[model samples]
Target: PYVPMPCMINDTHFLLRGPFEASWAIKLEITDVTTLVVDTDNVANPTNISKCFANNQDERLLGFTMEWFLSGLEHDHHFTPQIICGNVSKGEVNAQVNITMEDHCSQVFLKMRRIFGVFKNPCTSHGKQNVLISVSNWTNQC
Candidate 1:
């Protein structure tokens, strides 16, 4: 389920949470935006898709899976993967397009978030390692 709070995702900023999860807002002040590829085939190793948002090389996400509804978009577009093989250049994607979780479907098309939001409860743990593994498993089965 996505948070009711709608977020803006254009050339200005990006929201970082979904319904039931705390909000994490990021400003798009940097002049250069890095491009990244969503390697859905690599689910066993969850990736830090937020790497492009960091200011420097040392600034890295502990581990994060794609938060489909974090941006508070429509249901169909929620958590939908940005770039697919043929549509994009070898799975290349723009970092600002929208963050997405890569599902393990061999067909290689855009995949939407099936569970909506897993961390729906307040008691849900936010352990970096734990969340990484949990989301990774969730993405794999999606």
Candidate 2:
């Protein structure tokens, strides 16, 4: 079983940080796959949960935010999960990017290297673009 550490995104200052101390594996595989229908009509609704960081902001980051490396998948349709978790550890943590949204707890790994890259590269500079446009264009259902 995969355990998720404390994740928080302070919208007040636009800072996202999560310190997780765990021994990561190196090889991860998706043994199963499933389709999830994301109704856009109910997508903008905010979760009424009270926590350190707002839920809507977290949901936006979780649902719409795309990483720099995988951002190409939007147009070129590239499949490169290795690059996402490659720098996470020097072949120390082995884990797959399980793609199951129904559970709403699927693992989406983001390395610090890419996170820092955002600062160096502006968002308009193909840094971390929104997946909504590509996703909607690809599938009107998202």
Candidate 3:
């Protein structure tokens, strides 16, 4: 078993603890973005079917990509989530993020957060080693 690396108090990126009762959400600055792939049909087409991003910070989520699945309803077959900067009307997202969108099952996709946020929650405590953080120790704190 290994130790979990504590989140470093960084400056470039930000971390916000989601409301305890609400889903775990953060509003980090968007420094970069990429798309994750879903394999519902096992099609060997481009693995990345959508896009997401990062701040090139946190070793925990360095190359993480946002992605989701679809059930065929209505919308574009190939599309990326819209990135939106924080807007008071909708509430704060990352200072910037893929814009808020209506979930169109046909072209709908979700950030990796949508799919794994709960499992990624620290509260789950499933016993998996926090190797990502642990290995970064020498770099700063693992």
Candidate 4:
């Protein structure tokens, strides 16, 4: 049997300094897919948050906030109508963007690269901007 990964935030400040955009990821099997959430109280939240869109029901997971990417499906993070991540209205195009962490005890994390993300915005803040939002986490090795 396999066990959950024990992870937390790491030298993330340095990680963000690099050219690569910061991002977080986890294996689908480990995720609760049903909810797409992981309690990341210890892991610090991402420095990058959107200014154009206001987010609600925001939470930290695997050292990152849920509003960084992914939208559509059920509830969105934005307070207003967004072109990306889908909207609550019908014929508005439903989107389901989910990148998550999972662990029974601690938490599991992953590092995604060049991942394609769909987006929506207003006032010229729109389309897939290709922002590699990194949520790299710490997994105990020693």
Candidate 5:
């Protein structure tokens, strides 16, 4: 059996995204790189929404709420399925985001996108929600 492990605990971090089928991945410049923790035992969500940032200059992404859904994934686990969301307000080169990353499985992570490219996705619908924008192949400490 493949027992998963927690990654990059208490380390500075960077993130990337490649949409559903893009050739090049976008690097997410997460502000104050989140000190991450992963809980595979309860991999359905994360604890305590943190305040970090991954502001984008792209005009299209701001002005909407974002969501990262948890069903229909290629990598589903005992980790439950749900949605992660955030309110990102961006201004050209900067963003002030009250971003939420809830995957119960923080250490057990994946590819998602947002303007606040902290640790989570491609696009949230006008319905405003929140993908494969991924993290580096990180080596875990635990």
Candidate 6:
């Protein structure tokens, strides 16, 4: 079993600021390999999710957004899972990036606290560049 700790993202990989022994592994697919969209039960409007060459443009590439369900996966609170995006269409050159989070309840709470802020009048305008998120000071004793 892997145990995830309260950590921070400084780009690329997470920096452990707490105690944990979690190991990470990723599962990736490129359209042809993904069939969940067509296999899910009756949901009439199933969201079509995929990674591709937008406009088939290979140059002026800005970025992309990836999302998945964390609770749906089978794992303990100690495990941290990351969705890695790769396979850019350029000379067979691939670029990889990921979004990772701690799976524990306390760490999850702390993360939410940091993300939503403890208090606010009517909520603050949080922009992508203005968003400040973090998780730390995790201990088993709580």
Best by lDDT: 5
Model 4: residues with Cα > 4 Å off, grouped in runs: 1-64, 72-136, 139-142
Relative to the unseen true structure, what is the C-alpha lDDT of residue 51 in candidate 4, on a scale of 0 to 100?
22
lDDT of 6 by residue, 31-103 (tens): 1121112223211110211232232443221112112222322234344322222233323212221112222
Tens digit of lDDT per residue, candidate 4, span 14-47? Answer: 1221112213232112111232122232112222
C-alpha lDDT values of all predictions? 0.27, 0.23, 0.26, 0.23, 0.27, 0.25
Which order, best to worst by lDDT?
Answer: 5, 1, 3, 6, 4, 2
Q: Give each model a TM-score.
A: 0.22, 0.19, 0.22, 0.16, 0.22, 0.20
Candidate 6 similarity to native, TM-score? 0.20
* TM-score of model 4 vs. true structure: 0.16
- After superposition, the stretches of candidate 1 with alpha carbons farther than 4 Å from their true spots are 9-11, 21-32, 37-142
lDDT of 3 at 95: 26
Mark the 10 consecutive residues where model 2 has the least summed lDDT.
133-142
Which lDDT tens digits does candidate 2 get at residues 28-103?
A: 1223322212332312211211111122232333232332223334343233222211112232211223233321
Q: Give the alpha carbon lDDT tens digit for every residue of 47-133 in model 5.
A: 211112244433222111122322233245444433233323421211111123344224224433222234433122122121212
lDDT of 3 by residue, 2-86 (tens): 2212222342232332222222223333223323223343112112222222323343332221221222211344543433322
- Displacement of residue 56 (Cα, Å) in model 3 is 5.7
What 10-residue stretch in candidate 5 is worst by lDDT? 123-132
Runs of candidate 3 with Cα error greater than 4 angstroms are 1-52, 60-62, 65-77, 85-91, 95-103, 109-142
Give candidate 6 misplaced runs (Cα > 4 Å). 9-69, 72-84, 87-111, 114-125, 129-142
Q: Across residues 1-142, which tens digit of lDDT does each residue of candidate 1 receive?
A: 6432323343222233323433332222111233433565322211234333333233223113244323233233333434212122334222433222233121112122222222122112122111110110111111
Stretches of candidate 2 above 4 Å error?
1-29, 33-35, 38-65, 77-142
Judged by whole-model lDDT over C-alpha atoms, candidate 2 comes out at 0.23
